[PDB]
Amino acid sequence: RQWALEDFEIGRPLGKGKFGNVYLAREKQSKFILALKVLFKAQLEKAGVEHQLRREVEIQSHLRHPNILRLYGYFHDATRVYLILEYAPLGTVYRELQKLSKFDEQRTATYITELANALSYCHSKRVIHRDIKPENLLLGSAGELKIADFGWSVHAPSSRRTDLCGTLDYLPPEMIEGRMHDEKVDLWSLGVLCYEFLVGKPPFEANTYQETYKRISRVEFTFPDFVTEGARDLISRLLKHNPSQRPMLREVLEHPWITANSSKPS
Numbered sequence: 001r002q003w004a005l006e007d008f009e010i011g012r013p014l015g016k017g018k019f020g021n022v023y024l025a026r027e028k029q030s031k032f033i034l035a036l037k038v039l040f041k042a043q044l045e046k047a048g049v050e051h052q053l054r055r056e057v058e059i060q061s062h063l064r065h066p067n068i069l070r071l072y073g074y075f076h077d078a079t080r081v082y083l084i085l086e087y088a089p090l091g092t093v094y095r096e097l098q099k100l101s102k103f104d105e106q107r108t109a110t111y112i113t114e115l116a117n118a119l120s121y122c123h124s125k126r127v128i129h130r131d132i133k134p135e136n137l138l139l140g141s142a143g144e145l146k147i148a149d150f151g152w153s154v155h156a157p158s159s160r161r162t163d164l165c166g167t168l169d170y171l172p173p174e175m176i177e178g179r180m181h182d183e184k185v186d187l188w189s190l191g192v193l194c195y196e197f198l199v200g201k202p203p204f205e206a207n208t209y210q211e212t213y214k215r216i217s218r219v220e221f222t223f224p225d226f227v228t229e230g231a232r233d234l235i236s237r238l239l240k241h242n243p244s245q246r247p248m249l250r251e252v253l254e255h256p257w258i259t260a261n262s263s264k265p266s
């Protein structure tokens, strides 16, 4: 069924994104509340990212998981392209970090568990995210974490180009150095998130791209005193330069700190 802009009532601006804005919207006939992301054709093609948007839709048509944000469909008109998205009422984990500053071990462990499950499902369909970050983590009505943005995802064990513009904070060494990568990139991203959730800033943060680059490359991070031994263990196991030294997602779910602190099952 072909969608058009006049099928929806557009509402509150939900977020300002790199490639476009997200708005709340309601389908007129059903009164179905959802989110519409408006991306501009001109800009998408000028950046050479037009085909990646097609691949996201492709990948999202094959994904069904409670911790992954649904993409219901897409359409376009004279100047832009629209993603029809599941609406996540409690907003981004990004905003939640700003509000709360940092998360306790219980909330962190629960988010890592939900992430791990979502990513474990993705890797079993051979899909790897490559863009994991708090902006792309959304919260459903029960506060359940939902992964968004598969615009930078890849089909197979590949070595394709991700967004090296924008911060490098969540990208692993093998991606920033233009090396061949695989599903292990997502486990690095987990480690970076686990650190950020507990600390309030990501482990390789710097006010310069060039310094953040060097820090990721050296795997140069330190823990504040309030970060517990168990968390330090998990994070340290995830943030390994060599991809193959990083654990499997099921080891993370079985990690004693996760099981002791997570409120949600694996």
Ligand SMILES: CN(C)CCOc1ccc(-c2cc3c(NCCc4ccc(NC(=O)Nc5ccccc5)cc4)ncnc3o2)cc1
Binding pocket: 014, 015, 017, 019, 022, 035, 037, 049, 052, 053, 056, 083, 085, 086, 087, 088, 089, 090, 091, 092, 095, 136, 138, 148, 149, 150, 151, 152
């Ligand atoms: C105070 N506050 C907690 C109250 C509630 O506030 C909010 C705030 C935001 C939301 C919100 C944001 C949001 C949202 N944001 C968009 C997430 C997203 C989706 C798709 C993509 N994909 C993409 O950009 N792909 C791409 C890009 C360029 C080239 C190719 C592909 C990226 C990000 N999506 C769905 N539902 C949503 O709900 C909800 C409540």
